[PDB]
Design a protein around this ligand. Structure first.
Ligand code: OLA
Lengths: 45, 45, 45, 45, 45
């Protein structure tokens, strides 16, 4: 049959999944940065 | 037709993986938020 | 009903996301780095 | 067929690349989980 | 308008970028491990 339609469904799914990754990574950095600033004021240090 | 069958395979294979990367990062941020909470409550600071 | 233009769009939408995923990973690496250093000069260690 | 064979070559590469990222990532979570437990199981806190 | 040439340029860019992400990742793993080890040999805990 014609697989173009199928090939397009995969990319859209890819871009979808890729969007969650950008958000998760987006949030992860803020935590890491927050982690750095917290460990930056940690007294024992 | 063409290499659609082949090219389609790579894509499905690319998603399967990304789907996994997503979940990995997904859980990772959970392990990074706990770590963040732990340092915050760490009396050593 | 040629899906080329549409397909071509998802691609451009993927790279845009990657471009952003990449930039985020650069800053994250730079942040973690700074955090590894801080932990090293940590007295109580 | 045209640039098809060459596009398939890129897809196969992107796919091999994801694998690597996937793996490197599956390792980060261990390094991070572990790290999490240790920080948690710290007496100085 | 034959869009094959352009999609080929996109795929290639998808691999160029992925190589960055893959390259930036493995370095970060190194830092995360370096971080870990430091914590482990940290007295206070
Ligand atoms: C032909 C379709 C294009 C291929 C789709 C795949 C897109 C590339 C995906 C990149 C994965 C990036 C993952 C980065 C996660 C890093 C997480 C971390 O370091 O904490």
């Amino acid at each position: 049959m014609d697989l173009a339609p199928q090939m397009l469904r995969e990319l859209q799914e890819t871009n979808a999944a890729l969007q969650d990754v950008r958000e998760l990574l987006r949030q992860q950095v803020k935590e890491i940065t927050f982690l750095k600033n917290t460990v930056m004021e940690c007294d024992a240090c």
